[PDB]
Amino acid sequence: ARSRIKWAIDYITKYFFTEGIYLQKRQREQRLLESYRAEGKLGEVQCRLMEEPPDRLHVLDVGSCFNPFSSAPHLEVTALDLCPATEDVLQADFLKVEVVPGIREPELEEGSVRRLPASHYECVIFSLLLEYMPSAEQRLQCCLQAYDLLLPEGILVLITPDAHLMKNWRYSLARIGLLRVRFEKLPHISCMVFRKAISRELSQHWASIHREE
Ligand SMILES: Nc1ncnc2c1ncn2[C@@H]1O[C@H](C[C@@H](N)CC[C@H](N)C(=O)O)[C@@H](O)[C@H]1O
Numbered sequence: 001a002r003s004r005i006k007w008a009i010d011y012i013t014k015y016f017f018t019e020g021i022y023l024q025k026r027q028r029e030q031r032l033l034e035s036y037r038a039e040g041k042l043g044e045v046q047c048r049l050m051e052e053p054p055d056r057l058h059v060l061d062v063g064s065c066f067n068p069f070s071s072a073p074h075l076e077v078t079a080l081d082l083c084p085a086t087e088d089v090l091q092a093d094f095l096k097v098e099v100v101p102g103i104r105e106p107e108l109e110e111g112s113v114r115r116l117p118a119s120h121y122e123c124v125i126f127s128l129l130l131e132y133m134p135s136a137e138q139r140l141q142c143c144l145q146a147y148d149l150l151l152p153e154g155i156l157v158l159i160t161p162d163a164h165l166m167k168n169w170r171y172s173l174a175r176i177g178l179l180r181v182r183f184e185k186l187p188h189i190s191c192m193v194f195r196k197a198i199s200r201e202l203s204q205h206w207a208s209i210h211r212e213e
Helices: 004-018 021-038 136-149 164-174 200-208
Strands: 057-062 075-081 098-100 107-109 112-117 121-127 150-161 178-186 189-196
Touching: 004 021, 004 057, 004 121, 004 150, 004 178, 004 189, 021 150, 021 178, 021 200, 057 136, 098 136, 121 136, 136 150, 136 178, 164 178, 164 189, 164 200, 178 200
Parallel strands: 057 075, 057 121, 098 112, 121 150
Antiparallel strands: 107 112, 150 189, 178 189
16 A cells, blocks of 8 residues: 655655665766766766755646646645646646746746746656656656756656656656666555756767667
8 A cells, every 4th residue: 555645755855854765866877977978978967966955845747637746745846737636736737838947936827837847847747647648758758857857866756657658758767867776565656766866968878878779
């Protein structure tokens, strides 16, 4: 009876606060960048790193039917949904949202969220959302927008319903800068976390050497 909501809250706390996983992965990715540089495959790459996590994490719950994460301690949740079921969830079609730099809060037009702050959220949650998307092109679009919304070393929680697909998702997301850091099987669901690596070039290379036709 493990809830995807309880699993997600548990990981986020471990990642930023109680186990400092973000520092463990930083060191792992720094070691990987040195291994690639030592093979002549990569040279000078831009690396952007997070400061010490705040006491209140900025979380974006996309496809948030009812804002399950709003009550969690130390999570400032901004909730979005195409068909909100509760009054605390904002109306929006994520596929049409602009990721804007230079803004602090969502900007609404006609009651629908149309602009969100870039590199502002420590976490973005896609809990059983991507399968509602029609095409694969639009699923990837959701993750590309999440990467622009995340801060350096922020995380994308991806929960999907229930092989070679999960390794193709790892490849396709590593190609946009998101490396998988956790995979767990809960009843009828598969819970994964993807991290905005210190360098996109780094993740793009890991993907190139892990593509299997
Ligand atoms: N293009 C879209 N833009 C915004 N929200 C969407 C879009 N397509 C589906 N949704 C919402 O994503 C939600 C999918 C739900 N199954 C997930 C609800 C909740 N996140 C959960 O973990 O159960 C629905 O409430 C949809 O309204």
